[PDB]
């Protein structure tokens, strides 16, 4: 990672990806 800010932005991207995965999983299998 280039700096502390981009390292945090990378981690936040992975946290955002986790919530997106949760939404997709819950709609595709977690509820139906």
Curated annotation (Swiss-Prot):
The modification Proline amide is found at residue 32. It is found in: Secreted. It comes from the Eukaryota. Disulfide bonds join 1-7. Causes a rapid but short-lived drop in the level of calcium and phosphate in blood by promoting the incorporation of those ions in the bones. Belongs to the calcitonin family. This is Calcitonin-1. It comes from Oncorhynchus keta. The chain holds residues 83 to 114 of 136 of the full protein.
